[PDB]
């Protein structure tokens, strides 16, 4: 495909920028443990995937030690390719219609009171995987009546009826991440658009859902553009936002253009609070699902409302 080869050129050029030294404030909070090994056995036992593993998240030992983990539904092959993401690009296997039950069963086994779920893009499917995402939320809630669900979705190309199907499943939080700013958006997430992704949040808000998004900093954006994007998110109706640092998965991935200082993240968090977000969490290794249940509770109690 012409698009894959277009990206190959960019990735080969990415690799001309040598891997960056990480600043000293970027460090791993934990080591392997019984809880990690047990969670990993379960995930493999149930033929599931986690984004924690597939996207190479550095918090995996910290989160899993706390029995917090985020499922990746739809397989481990994505039909899209974003220049920060190390999840495999490929042709997905057949739709596993039994996956929603197994996620739900795993949540029960884990005894989770809040479950976080994301997945890959499924452009191979007629409905782009809308049924899969909805059914996973439904399956979790059926098996786990008092468990909150946070669902981090692709955009389903912004198609209203695909979106409506997902929204109808009624997650406690609907997340969809704009990730970066309009000037460089195409260079980072070419299969999406800034405005389409904002429109997904607005659609979720209009459907009565609490909404969440994320920004990945260090991709070329300025802090002024970050402040504009936070305003855009808020105005679009986004309730909860995470503000985070890009880690480069490999030489073939986008270079790290800057390391945002911990004090700068504090300032971004304050700015977002000031704009009226119900929930804000900022920091270099903050991630969309990171401590999400605790963030949800905080949002659920805020004057802001959500």
């Amino acid at each position: 495909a012409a698009e894959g080869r277009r990206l190959l050129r960019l990735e080969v050029r990415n690799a001309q920028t040598p891997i960056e030294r990480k600043p000293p404030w970027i460090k791993t909070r934990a080591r392997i443990g019984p809880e990690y090994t047990e969670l990993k056995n379960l995930v493999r036992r149930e033929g599931l995937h986690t984004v924690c593993e597939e996207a190479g998240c550095p918090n995996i030992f910290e989160c899993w030690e706390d029995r917090e983990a985020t499922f990746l539904i739809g397989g481990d092959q994505c039909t899209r390719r974003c220049d920060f993401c190390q999840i495999d690009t490929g042709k997905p296997a057949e739709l596993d219609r039994d996956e929603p039950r197994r996620v739900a069963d795993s949540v029960r086994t884990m005894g989770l009171r809040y479950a976080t779920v994301t997945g890959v893009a499924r452009d191979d499917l007629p409905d782009g995987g809308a049924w899969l995402y909805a059914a996973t939320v439904r399956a979790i809630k059926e098996l786990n009546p008092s468990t909150g669900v946070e669902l981090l979705i692709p955009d389903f190309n912004g198609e209203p009826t695909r979106l409506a199907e997902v929204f109808e499943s009624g997650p406690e939080v609907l997340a969809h991440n704009v990730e970066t700013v309009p000037r460089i958006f195409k260079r980072i997430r070419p299969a999406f658009t800034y405005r389409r992704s904002l429109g997904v949040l607005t659609a979720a808000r209009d459907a009565g859902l609490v909404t969440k998004s994320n920004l990945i900093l260090g991709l070329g954006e300025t802090s002024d553009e970050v402040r504009t994007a936070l305003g855009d998110l808020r105005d679009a109706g986004c309730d909860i936002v995470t503000i985070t640092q890009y880690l480069r998965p490999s030489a073939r991935h986008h270079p790290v253009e800057r390391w945002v200082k911990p004090e700068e993240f504090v300032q971004f968090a304050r700015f977002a609070e000031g704009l009226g977000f119900a929930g804000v969490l900022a920091g270099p290794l903050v991630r969309s699902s990171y401590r999400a249940g605790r963030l949800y509770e905080q949002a659920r109690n805020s004057r802001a409302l959500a």
């Binding site: 891997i19 030294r21 990480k22 600043p23 000293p24 404030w25 970027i26 460090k27 791993t28 593993e53 597939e54 190479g56 998240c57 550095p58 995996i60 190390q86 880690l247 480069r248 998965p249």
Partner: peptide, 8 residues
């Protein structure tokens, strides 16, 4: 699985 590198 392959975890992104932090400071060395």
């Amino acid at each position: 699985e392959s975890t992104x590198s932090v400071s060395d």
